[PDB]
Structures are given as structure tokens and as C-alpha cells.
Design an enzyme around this catalytic site. Structure first.
Site, PDB file in Angstrom:
ATOM      1  CB  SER B  50      -1.015   0.020   1.146  1.00 35.56           C
ATOM      2  OG  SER B  50      -1.940  -1.050   1.013  1.00 35.56           O
ATOM      3  CE  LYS B  53      -4.714   1.785  -0.605  1.00 38.78           C
ATOM      4  NZ  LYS B  53      -3.922   0.534  -0.480  1.00 38.78           N
ATOM      5  CB  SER B  98      -4.367   1.421   3.852  1.00 38.27           C
ATOM      6  OG  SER B  98      -3.452   0.989   2.880  1.00 38.27           O
ATOM      7  NE  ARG B 230       2.911  -0.948   9.641  1.00 37.55           N
ATOM      8  CZ  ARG B 230       1.773  -0.907   8.960  1.00 37.55           C
ATOM      9  NH1 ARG B 230       1.730  -1.209   7.669  1.00 37.55           N
ATOM     10  NH2 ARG B 230       0.656  -0.536   9.581  1.00 37.55           N
TER      11      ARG B 230
END
Ligand SMILES: [Cl-]
Lengths: 245, 245
Positions: B50, B53, B98, B230
Site C-alpha cells: 500500500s 497508494k 489504506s 513500523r
């Protein structure tokens, strides 16, 4: 049936808890309805002080006085009382720290003729720039009410002002004040000290996933000790209305 | 002479503390110098998932598939596992949550020929869209390294990608993740689960008053349990390097 502007005097408890006086004005964009603790003060026009950095930025960008948000305006070398002003700035940081001398230079380059034409095109307040072109928003003739601030901000949000879309997007970027997973606040503080009554302002909006709440607040500010109450009282209202957690 | 790229293995302590493995890459824009805990992995190529994106948004905007950040993409009525996907979205919220199905529809409208042409023009990773037109960034042939993510993001920051300045400004707005008086983070998460090795990504930048730090991290992600690492590991590195308080 319902009114366009509803008065909610329970918000006065937030002012009284802080031994202060003022107005918070909210506009629910989806509902097309507004809310305030004091309809009269919501419509009282005051000097905009540094909230004028919003239209000043738009005009400077549209005329090319400011090329983009990264252009550096070097410190002129005069040590002023506010330490953050004694350094180089771009549009982002000049708005963040309310750097008056940078915006005074923009205003001089814009000039009185173009400044007046733009404010008329913006329908901004009383459209009066009497006084010095580089200080009228601090001690000159311009006056704008909280509801008039909201009207202007709604146009900016929708890219409906009579400057380019680019100029409007850049100023909305420069207005960025806070963002997290719950909301985004784009806003500008102001502090009017030169002409009575001394007041503080906070104007802008709260972006949610599925709505926008515009806001404009002002409050009596006899000393600088209360400046933090501009945001704190606004947030107490936003929390009471379940706009932010 | 000084080094453009320096390895700092002390950052491995942040991965070990969380029983994890991965790479954080930082780029100091002012100094034109980069830093990472693992030079080899920083330059190895993985599915973007993602994080794609970002380019997908730019292409959809520049071609007019998406008119602006307010256009509504109605929920197709299929209940999916991630609850936030089961509602109408715009570009802001589709990025924030997302929302894969919204972006799969963008990709189908863009089509193979234009998608490939755009990725070549962006110099994006290996520029290879092999696989399904609406899933190649999840299980097709496209690959990009953390250092290549930084190079792409630097172009976006500077409005240097070939698409319009408007498209770049809109996507940078939609990347807004966090903002306060200390920093602004614009970024995009990703989670590659369909092809081994399963990894999580976070790529973006940290805007300071007088500098910008670009970042790209990926880490092994065998289940969704560790997805919050993350951001957490990236922030531990940013704090160690005194970039954020
Ligand atoms: Cl923004």
C-alpha cells in the site's frame, strides 16, 4: 423551525472557569448551521491582528511577492523581543510563529492599491485598510467579526476566493496547526494589543473524516498570560460538542 | 571526503528490543547525507504494497480519474474484514485507512498502458507492472527498495515528478499523518502479505522548521500483530537522532 445560528450559553462556563470573557463560534458545514455562546459578540467586528496573515499570505502568493512556501525571507538583523522572530523564515514558519516583520515586508511589496483591491475582492470584513499598509491589521481601520471570519474561511476551504487554487492550497498548508488520527486543525492565532479592547483570536477549522467544523473565537486579553486560553477554551467547546475526543 | 551514506548499527537495538528484523533509512535533506542500520537491505527491492497508494493517487489525479480530494467513492456494499473499508471514502480517508478496493478501482480506470507509462516517467522502482492490473503492487512484479522510496519521495516533496504541481500538492495533503508544534509527518504505511517475505513498510518524511528528514523503513511482518512497530521503531530512531523530541 430551526435557526441558522443557535445560541448555546452553556459554553460560558468554559470562559468563567478560566476567569475570562469571549465568544466561540462554530459552523457545521454538513448541517449548514452555526452555534455560539454569544450571538452579539459573534457579530462584533474587531481588529484581526495576526489572523490577517491568512489573507495577507493569499495576496502575497497570488501576486508573486511570495513565490512558494519554501522561499526564505532572511532576518533583517534587528533583535526583536520574540526570539523566534530573530531568524530566517519561510511562509510556513512565518505563519507558525506569527512573524510580524516578515508579513510587514510582504504588505509593503503588495502596496496599498493592490491590498485594497484584494480585500474588496475577498469581501473581507469592513474592507478598510486605513493606516499604514504595513500595520493596518494591528492599529489601522480594518475590522472583522467572528462570523465574517467564518464566511471568509469557508470560501478558502472551498477554493472559492478570487485568487488561484494554488494560492489557496498553499495557505491552507501553511495554516496546518495539529493533526492526528482523530482530526486535523488548520488555523491562525491573533493577539490585538495596540488598540483597545485587547483581545486574542483563534480562527480556522477542524477537518473530520466526513465533515468540517469551522471556528472563530475571540476573548478579552488584558495581559499575555492568558494567550493559551485561545486554544484551550476552543478545545473545551469542541470536546463538549463531541467534535474531538 | 565525507560519506553520502553511513551505516549505524546501533539502531539494530530498536529492532532487537522488539524481537524484529528490518531496515530504517533516513535522509537529511539539508546535508545531503543518508543513514541506515543496514546498507544492504536499504538497497534491496520488495513489493511496495500500500505504499503504492502514493504513485497511484498521483496518476489517478493527473489523469482525472479522481477530480479532487473531496470526490466520493461510494462503498460497493461488499462487507470486508477491515471495518473502516465498509463505508464511502474520499482520497483523504482512502489513504488514511489504506482502502485497497478504492485504489483497485483507480487502477482499472487508469489501465495497463497509462499505468506503465507513468511508472517509467516516475522512475519508480523497477517500473514493472506485470501481474493483475488491479493487484500488481500486492502480488505482481513491481519492486522498490527503501532508498528508491526516498528518491521518489524527494521528487514528490520538491514537486519534481512529471505530473502537475496540483496533483503533487493534493497527494502530499493526503499523506498528512501527524502534526504538532515540533514536526509534521507526511507518510504512507504498507503491508505486503501475499508474497514472501511478508514485510511492513512506512515511508514518508518529517518536516522541521529548517530541515526535512526523509525516511523509508521495512521490517519482517509474519503476522499483523506487529504492524504498530513500523511507526514505533521509526520514531525510536528519530528520537535517538534528535529529530523529534
Ligand atoms: Cl497539509
Amino acid at each position: 423551525g430551526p435557526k441558522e445560528w443557535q445560541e448555546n450559553k452553556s459554553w460560558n462556563a468554559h470562559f468563567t472557569e478560566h476567569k475570562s470573557q469571549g465568544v466561540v463560534v462554530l459552523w457545521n458545514e454538513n448541517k449548514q448551521q452555526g452555534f455560539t455562546n454569544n450571538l452579539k459578540r459573534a457579530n462584533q467586528a474587531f481588529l484581526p491582528a495576526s489572523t490577517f496573515k491568512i489573507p495577507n499570505s493569499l495576496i502575497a502568493l497570488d501576486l508573486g511577492v511570495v513565490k512558494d512556501e519554501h522561499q526564505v525571507f532572511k532576518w533583517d538583523g534587528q533583535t526583536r523581543d520574540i526570539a523566534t522572530w530573530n531568524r530566517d523564515h519561510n511562509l510556513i514558519t512565518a505563519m507558525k510563529y506569527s512573524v510580524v516583520p516578515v508579513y510587514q515586508e510582504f504588505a509593503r511589496q503588495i502596496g496599498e492599491a493592490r491590498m485594497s483591491k484584494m480585500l474588496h475582492a475577498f469581501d473581507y470584513g469592513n474592507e478598510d485598510i486605513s493606516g499604514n499598509v504595513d500595520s493596518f491589521w494591528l492599529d489601522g481601520g480594518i475590522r472583522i467579526s467572528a462570523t465574517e471570519q467564518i464566511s471568509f474561511l469557508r470560501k478558502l476551504y472551498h477554493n472559492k476566493l478570487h485568487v488561484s487554487e494554488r494560492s489557496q492550497r498553499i495557505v491552507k498548508q501553511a495554516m496546518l496547526t495539529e493533526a492526528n488520527g482523530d482530526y486535523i486543525i488548520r488555523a491562525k492565532t491573533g493577539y490585538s494589543t495596540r488598540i483597545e479592547p485587547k483581545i486574542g483570536w483563534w480562527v480556522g477549522w477542524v477537518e473530520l473524516d466526513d465533515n468540517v467544523w469551522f471556528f472563530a473565537m475571540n476573548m478579552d486579553m488584558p495581559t499575555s498570560d492568558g494567550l493559551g486560553l485561545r486554544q484551550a477554551i476552543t478545545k473545551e467547546v469542541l470536546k463538549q460538542e463531541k467534535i474531538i475526543p
